[PDB]
Amino acid sequence: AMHVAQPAVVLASSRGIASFVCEYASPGKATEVRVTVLRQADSQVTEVCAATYMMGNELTFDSICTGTSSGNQVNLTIQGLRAMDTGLYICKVELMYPPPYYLGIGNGTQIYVI
């Protein structure tokens, strides 16, 4: 079974930087994987970030985001935040190759900006 695990709460930096590790468990040992940071609010959902990367090799970046890949976790750093950006941020890992395709959606991270 596919499980994605992100922290419950992160407070944001005085400058506007929130950082959180996003760990996943593949039943396979997949190589091409695609991470998406999502924002939830009511039934709606909005794209914040999206990255595709291959294995151990570096993360490729939506400009608002940066990160690192250190094994089977991804250190997603969001910046350029306003007080208005406080909400629920979902980690979405997709394992793309080799087969089978697996989809993983997290429980969400509450980011606070004050």
Partner: antibody, heavy 118, light 109 residues
Framework: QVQLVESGGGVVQPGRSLRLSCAAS????????MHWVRQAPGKGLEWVTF????????YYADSVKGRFTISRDNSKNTLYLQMNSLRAEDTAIYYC???????????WGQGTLVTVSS | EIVLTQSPGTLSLSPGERATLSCRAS???????LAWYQQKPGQAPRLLIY???SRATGIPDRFSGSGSGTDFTLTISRLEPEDFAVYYC?????????FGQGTKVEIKR
């Protein structure tokens, strides 16, 4: 305004090929991943094929593997299905569908009947 | 290949009555990456429920989803005349995407 209009169904003799098209509207198509799903007359829903956001990754149902290709012209906002060595059992209504943000098939095409007989 | 078996084939319920549709999987289904669809014949499927229990935009209150692991239920709390249709459960957490054979729901007279 979300719309998926598919076209170019019809009749094919067995062995010969046929390419289906689905044209997307009022969402930034580039951003959402796509599928095809057929429905044999009076039978259930069968997933046929999946295409990545870019097209760098493609997945096919066992029963079409080797014979069908999925592709996308992003700037034309169009999804395609090349079908190659059509069998009589490939006769179905072919649905184009969009994968939701969080995984389900949220929007569907209208349907396009492909008949494979000599 | 995660197989999905829905039961029964046919629910025979009068309008107003509750309808309870079952979907059971060959193995456990992710973190509830399981959908429900509706199909009124000669029309495309329409998404009803995703994430086992969350309702699709513009689907009315009467539709209701439950379950976890290999067991999932769709509840229609009262059958209105537009609800008499064919329903498919689907898993979408891993490839191949698979549907169940569908439960048809007919008018009982």
């Amino acid at each position: 305004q979300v719309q998926l209009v598919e076209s170019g169904g019809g009749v094919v003799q067995p062995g010969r090929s046929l390419r289906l098209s689905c044209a997307a509207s009022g969402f930034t198509f580039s951003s959402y991943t796509m599928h095809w799903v057929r429905q044999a007359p009076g039978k259930g829903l069968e997933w046929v094929t999946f295409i990545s956001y870019d097209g760098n990754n493609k997945y096919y149902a066992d029963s079409v593997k080797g014979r069908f290709t999925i592709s996308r012209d992003n700037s034309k906002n169009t999804l395609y299905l090349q079908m190659n060595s059509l069998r009589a059992e490939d006769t179905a209504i072919y649905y184009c569908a969009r994968t939701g943000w969080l995984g389900p098939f949220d929007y569907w095409g209208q349907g396009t009947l492909v008949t494979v007989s000599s | 290949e995660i197989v999905l078996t829905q039961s029964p084939g046919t629910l025979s319920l009068s309008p107003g009555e509750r309808a309870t549709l079952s979907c059971r999987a060959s193995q456990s289904v992710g973190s509830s990456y399981l959908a429900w669809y509706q199909q009124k014949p000669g029309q495309a499927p329409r998404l009803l429920i995703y994430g086992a229990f969350s309702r699709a935009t513009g689907i009315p209150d009467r539709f209701s989803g439950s379950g976890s692991g290999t067991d999932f239920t769709l509840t229609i709390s009262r059958l209105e005349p537009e609800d008499f249709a064919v329903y498919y459960c689907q898993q979408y957490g891993s490839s191949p995407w698979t549907f169940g054979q569908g439960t048809k729901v007919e008018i009982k007279r």
